[PDB]
Design a protein around this ligand. Structure first.
Ligand SMILES: Nc1nc2c(ncn2[C@@H]2O[C@H](COP(=O)(O)OP(=O)(O)OP(=O)(O)O)[C@@H](O)[C@H]2O)c(=O)[nH]1
Ligand SMILES: Nc1nc2c(ncn2[C@@H]2O[C@H](COP(=O)(O)OP(=O)(O)OP(=O)(O)O)[C@@H](O)[C@H]2O)c(=O)[nH]1
Ligand SMILES: Nc1nc2c(ncn2[C@@H]2O[C@H](COP(=O)(O)OP(=O)(O)O)[C@@H](O)[C@H]2O)c(=O)[nH]1
Ligand SMILES: Nc1nc2c(ncn2[C@@H]2O[C@H](COP(=O)(O)OP(=O)(O)O)[C@@H](O)[C@H]2O)c(=O)[nH]1
Ligand SMILES: [Mg+2]
Ligand SMILES: [Mg+2]
Lengths: 429, 432, 432, 429
């Protein structure tokens, strides 16, 4: 029960998910083929949430992989763990988004979205009691921004009572990876605030620091970044897939972490993160995992939490550990940093403990932070948006695809309606 | 003959009963298969074979904690129609426990209760195990206690709640769930026993010398409480006490029915020696404020009624020698209208020790059930945690969108304000 | 000595008897070869050798379901002249069952009945197994029940029909076949036991915990019904009941003779334990509306006569202790003119379990045969399914072209309207 | 008992049947010679319906193969399973129909039809109790339209109480395969409405989609299309040839599916249909087989059922399965699509389950749909007919063969009398 349909949009959403279904298949002991090869029945106890049971004792992932060009899917289906997906789920177009939101949301996205939702409706009816849909995409690209946010608006109309959590790779402060990424972000955040129950802002600049500073990787590839994203992604639903001493799920993390329905933009964190040499020189205790989360240099969203206040905090733990040792440390970070947490939410720390650790670790943590520190994430993008839009730069690549300037005026005002709300509840007493 | 069925709501309620029904099977020699190689009738109905099944209803809206019972050691013990699962949890949402998801299986739970009540001939009352934090233990319990007071009314319904700690919280909306679940359970539940996690964290660290206590270990101490309350039913004692006697001796007013449990002796194996544990020694341990199981300071309040439930090698003259000293002590003060603030129970049977347990084998024990004014400080915090969150209307859209009115929170808060001034009205002395 | 022959019409009738005669051979120790390594005389005539053959007539207009009996396990059991086949089926056409194909072998079937009735010395009545959906079970049965009332008249003819479900249908013209077969069987059949598929789908899923029940499994439950009705003939009981007693106790008016069967306990092997199954427990299971075998709500109607047929380890004082409570319960209400709404039967023999069966071995059972007002909701649907189809004259040319008049449907519908207002006339109370 | 005489007319009717008798001989375990080589006696239990038992333990098909040119029969008798037919049954002319209805029904057909019916009467008297005749032909050709519908009018006069089901390959919307196919169709539908108890409209455009979209065949030949037709054809009479838990036959499918004696034009469907790779990634359950039937892209008649209402629906299942799992799904598609079924027929779903699966499958389904959606099949042909006839185009190839214009005026009015009836019972309340 409580099954999750995983949707991937964009080149980024596919390359995250191709690493994500590598982690899930290793946690559940699944071979490259699709057959179970673990040791305990706890892996098959809740196998049905991310898997349909096929005939012949094989499991297929309940995944829907969407792109507008076939270049990324051919990398998926030919690599390792590409032979596990159903070939019906790969719903790809031919034209490609062209790194364009309007081509992803209006022109080439709408010529494919009806062939996606029929696969969504096929996977949703195969679920016994549906929990909700998780989406992996970016906000800088064209497919992950356009086709991704087009899928959310169609699903929320069809499935309003389900949770719709997105793992949005938000662009970086220092570097860009797309010239029109302030246009792709702001037009997508317009669609995220109205149709997603929560959204996990991940920045590539922050993962560049964590691979360099914390993990001591001199040469991190994308496959090393996505293993840190997927460690968060499996860590969010690890209490849904396994017994724990305090079980959480996607609805417990929805209710506890969203005080106001717009303010559902989170920053994730993972712990422990150690190098090869630097892991035997460290005791893996719950006070060590606690203090590794709540600092600045372990945030996957490129903003210092010290510039704002945490509204709500969720800490999903994995592995056998003691609850007092947890509940002291969740109290300990609230006492010494009482100015860093918001005042009018007393005891703003959500605790969750799963009994099953990750593979090869004694214990692990998964931090979910909802702070006012991501107002600088949207102060920066709306400044980068308004600087480009006041010269109407790159407007004709979107105006030529059916869009007017009024779409930008509403989307920019919606983000400044969002920034003024984080500034409101940061100054709130 | 004096049967008493139990209900286990929420993840907290099931994991408590996983230790409680572990404890009861060891006190009666019951295997996990229901086998034993006439006093057990108050909890174990008998089948045609030599197999006994418990009078328990395990209910959760999510199937994870139930399936660990279905695959655990006690698979062969429980009747599988009693293990009730929903599909989606209430998920720290009182409205989803009470309106959205809870209404879907409330008729299934009342059906399983009514099948148990028909095979009971002397049914005394109910033991509802739940918490105040989770949405299931708040919403579904408050939905259930509405229905049991309709269908039964006169049966003595007891609750064993996990009260939220002052500084130790596991969920963010615990101040919302605790206020909403108490507004409903007030006019229905006869006596709700508060239990706190932080106080057992204090006891398992200090008194048991455990560095790292688990939720396995906290549920052992709550099981020793509920066993010692029903020890007078399940065993013959020198001075017995029924569940109907607890609501009579401890509830002076229909609003105030919230005592706090306290167990003693809580000592390890290395401290099982090095002290003699008289009935004078274990009774002074209970009224010591560091050994209670709700984080409240009883020196900041007054006791209204105390209930000492002794068991084991207990001598009733040494009981009076222990108790009469405590009325002389200044730190234990009572309310002016209550000269007789004591109910004493003695059982012949000692508490046995669960193997793998952290408690040691003792010849005698005591489960103090004391109703005090010092719990009003606990409600004064919980309204203060409520009034800070609700003034900004935080998290209200999660509750309004699931069928609840926004004006219903003002009904629960003003009623809790009316409950708070009740302790101030009782806590003062009498004129003339 | 009290012989009772059985007729099996249609594909539904044969597949029921494939489980029924499987069940009877296990209750008497009878091999499938007719061998056994004096109470069986009510169904098994004896040959000169040590071989017993059943008093059964299997008739179908298509040979497929008969030939699977002729090639199955029970080839050596049945007399091959009793296995009657046509050539073409009636094929969901009531007119082909009653006029076209049914007239071709009706003289062959009456010949095989009359050869069975001559070797019976104390013949009580008939057990016609058929359905309302198929053309054979509708047309050929209604042709047959005309002829048996001519040739016998005073024998107690019982029917065990497969009533069409409200939302679960296997054929499109089931509303046509059910109305036409009831207009004819009304003045001929003494008591027709309704059985529904959807209600057994509810029972095999919920009560038996089977995810995927087969038509093999549904016919086991109908076999336990017919065995428990004839358990008082085939075995010596503490309080016996003959087939002549059922039509007396259950039929208040010659129109209303449609009770609905209900069996209990229906539990699996994992739930064979975990409950004691008293006669109080299995009797409250029957009057529970979820456990009946016709999709009707008895809380929406009134019972006119209930017939509890106990068997096995049954104590008659505990019977009265179970039954007298049910008259006090508000959900079971009777009609105002019937203070005595009960017929109780007790047999000493338990129901045995067929190997490969889904039911578990129980020490006692109950086959409730209750005539109620709640079946009038079932006929109110079936006329409503009839009136929508017939108003557009759908499918009428399949019936007119096979010898039936179009005005005959108006005769069957107005008569069923007269049957529908009979329950409204009986269901009201009496003036003064 | 209940024997069926199979008649083939036209090039199309021969090439369907040559694949059809390949399937029947594989189901019954019959060699290329004609001898039994199966494993169970269930194959020989009902062998007599499609076979006569010859001397020497050999079985010949009860088939009558009719053409007007010897080109197709020489392809039949020389290919695989051509040595199993009796050489007496191949009744072929020499002139050929010339893709002409008038040459098939009046001139060259009547010079052969007396030599066909004497073979029909020979096979009918060899039957113990005849069930009825199945005919395989097209409506676009000349022999399958002319000689085929000439056989129906002669047989129904000789055998009125028997069923006469035709498997008519109806022409396609997008492409034609014959210039005068609106003339060949409308003059044949004039003969189908008066003398056939049911008729299964199959379109070649629809099988082109099912081979491409559903089966993922890039290069489907005619031998791959006819295996999908023959899977329907064996699936219609699979409960007549084998024991089932709810047996149907050709008369049960006649009575349940024809509410009005003209409205007997069906659309078939088959399930499961999977590719080579895409079959191990799918669980073969009854809810999967159910939802594969009732959509649009599995209809072998090129019309969307969503444009109309199903009058009656038959679902003949094969293989060991559970009846509740069937009867829930037959209810489940009626609840969520209550606007898609006709209202004044409550519970319009016929259920049939055969115990014997097809070869190499665990379970299978055979959908028979009678909808108002085939009014667009006859709205299109009668529009294509009237466009050609109002210019009297190609009239002299039929007027020269004994026909007048009054034959066309009656046949066009008969089809508009048919279209007005489907429009009548679609708007009926
Ligand atoms: N004493 C004790 N308390 C527990 C234990 N496990 C969980 N809890 C308490 O349960 C509270 C949360 O309620 P849960 O039972 O986990 O959740 P729920 O009642 O099922 O409601 P949901 O939110 O829908 O899951 C926490 O505040 C914990 O204090 C335990 O083993 N022992
Ligand atoms: N309870 C039960 N009902 C069955 C079973 N098999 C078939 N039926 C019912 O039989 C009804 C249809 O009647 P059939 O017996 O199949 O057909 P028939 O009576 O032989 O008449 P024809 O149409 O001529 O074949 C369906 O509605 C089914 O509900 C069975 O095994 N158990
Ligand atoms: N974390 C992560 N981000 C990526 C990866 N590949 C691309 N991205 C991000 O995706 C954005 C480009 O979106 P992309 O999916 O390639 O464009 P689209 O296909 O049109 O949606 C860039 O801003 C990158 O930062 C990856 O492997 N890991
Ligand atoms: N499904 C199918 N249809 C065919 C096949 N061969 C021909 N047809 C159809 O048959 C029609 C032509 O009829 P044909 O039999 O060749 O003409 P005839 O010999 O004069 O009756 C065309 O519309 C084709 O669509 C085949 O192998 N399969
Ligand atoms: Mg819970
Ligand atoms: Mg039949």
């Amino acid at each position: 029960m409580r099954e999750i349909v995983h949707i991937q949009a964009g080149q980024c959403g596919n390359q995250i998910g191709a690493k994500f279904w590598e982690v899930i298949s290793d946690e559940h002991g699944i071979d490259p083929t699709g057959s179970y090869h673990g040791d305990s029945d706890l892996q098959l106890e809740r196998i049905n949430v991310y898997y349909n049971e096929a005939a012949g004792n094989k499991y297929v992932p309940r995944a829907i992989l969407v792109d507008l060009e076939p270049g990324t899917m051919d990398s998926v289906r030919s690599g390792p763990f590409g032979q596990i997906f159903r070939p019906d789920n790969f719903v790809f177009g031919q034209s490609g988004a062209g790194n364009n939101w309007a081509k992803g949301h209006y022109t080439e996205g709408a010529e494919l979205v009806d062939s996606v939702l029929d696969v969504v409706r096929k996977e949703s009816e195969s679920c016994d009691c549906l929990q909700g849909f998780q989406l992996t995409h970016s906000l800088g690209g064209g497919t992950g921004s356009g086709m991704g946010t087009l899928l959310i608006s169609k699903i929320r109309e069809e499935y309003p009572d389900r949770i719709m959590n997105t793992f949005s790779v938000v662009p970086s402060p220092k570097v860009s990876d797309t010239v029109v990424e302030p246009y792709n972000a702001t037009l997508s955040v317009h669609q995220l605030v109205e149709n997603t129950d929560e959204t996990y802002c991940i920045d590539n600049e922050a993962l560049y620091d964590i691979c360099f500073r914390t993990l001591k990787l001199t040469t991190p590839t994308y496959g090393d970044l996505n293993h840190l994203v997927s460690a968060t992604m499996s860590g969010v639903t690890t209490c849904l897939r396994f017994p724990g001493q305090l079980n959480a799920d996607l609805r417990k993390l929805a209710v506890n972490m969203v005080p106001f329905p717009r303010l559902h933009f989170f920053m994730p964190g993972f712990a422990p993160l150690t190098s090869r040499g630097s892991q035997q020189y460290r005791a893996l205790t719950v006070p060590e995992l606690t203090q590794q989360m709540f600092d600045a240099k372990n945030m996957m969203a490129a903003c210092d939490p010290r510039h704002g206040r945490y509204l709500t905090v969720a800490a999903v733990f994995r592995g056998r550990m003691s609850m007092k040792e947890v509940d002291e440390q969740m109290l300990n970070v609230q006492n010494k940093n009482s100015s860093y947490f918001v005042e009018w939410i007393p005891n703003n720390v959500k605790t969750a403990v799963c009994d099953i650790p990750p593979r090869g670790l004694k214990m692990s943590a998964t931090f979910i932070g909802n702070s006012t520190a991501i107002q600088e994430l949207f102060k920066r993008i709306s400044e980068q948006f308004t600087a480009m839009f006041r010269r109407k730069a790159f407007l004709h690549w979107y105006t030529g695809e059916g869009m007017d300037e009024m779409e930008f005026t509403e989307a920019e005002s919606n983000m400044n309606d969002l920034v003024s709300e984080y500034q409101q509840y940061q100054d709130a007493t | 003959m004096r049967e008493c069925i139990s209900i286990h709501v929420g993840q907290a309620g099931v994991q408590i009963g996983n230790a409680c029904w572990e404890l009861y099977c060891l006190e009666h020699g019951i295997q996990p298969d229901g086998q034993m190689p006439d006093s057990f009738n108050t909890f174990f109905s008998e089948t045609g074979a030599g197999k006994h099944v418990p009078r328990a209803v395990f209910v959760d809206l999510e199937p994870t904690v139930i399936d660990e019972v279905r695959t655990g050691t006690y698979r062969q013990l429980f009747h599988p129609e009693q293990l009730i699962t929903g599909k989606e949890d209430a998920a720290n949402n009182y409205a989803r426990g009470h309106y959205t998801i809870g209404k879907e299986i409330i008729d299934l739970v009342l059906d399983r209760i009514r099948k148990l009540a028909d095979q009971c001939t002397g049914l005394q009352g109910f033991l509802v195990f739940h918490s105040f934090g989770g949405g299931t233990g708040s919403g579904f319990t408050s939905l259930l206690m509405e229905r049991l007071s309709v269908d039964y009314g006169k049966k003595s319904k007891l609750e064993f709640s996990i009260y939220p700690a002052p500084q130790v919280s596991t969920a963010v909306v615990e101040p919302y769930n605790s206020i909403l679940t108490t507004h409903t359970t007030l006019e229905h539940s006869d006596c709700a026993f508060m239990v706190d996690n932080e106080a057992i964290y204090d006891i398992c660290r200090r008194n048991l010398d455990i560095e790292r206590p688990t939720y396995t270990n906290l549920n052992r101490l709550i099981s020793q409480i509920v066993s010692s309350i029903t020890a007078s039913l399940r065993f013959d004692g020198a001075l017995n006490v029924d569940l109907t006697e607890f609501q009579t001796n401890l509830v002076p007013y229909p609003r105030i029915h919230f005592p706090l449990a306290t167990y003693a002796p809580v000592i390890s194996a290395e401290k099982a020696y090095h002290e003699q544990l008289s009935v004078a020694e274990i009774t002074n341990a209970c009224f010591e404020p560091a050994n209670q199981m709700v984080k409240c300071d009883p020196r900041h309040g007054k006791y209204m009624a105390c209930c000492l439930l002794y068991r084991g090698d207990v001598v009733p003259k040494d009981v009076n020698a222990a108790i009469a000293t405590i009325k002389t002590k200044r730190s234990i003060q009572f309310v002016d209208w209550c000269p007789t603030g004591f109910k004493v129970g003695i059982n012949y049977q000692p508490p046995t020790v669960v193997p793998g347990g952290d408690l040691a084998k003792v010849q005698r024990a005591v489960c103090m059930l004391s109703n005090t004014t010092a719990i009003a400080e606990a409600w004064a915090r919980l309204d203060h945690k409520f009034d800070l969150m609700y003034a900004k209307r935080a998290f209200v859209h999660w509750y309004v969108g699931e069928g609840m009115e926004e004006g219903e929170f003002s009904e629960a808060r003003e009623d809790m304000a009316a409950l708070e001034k009740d302790y101030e009205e009782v806590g003062v002395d009498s004129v003339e």
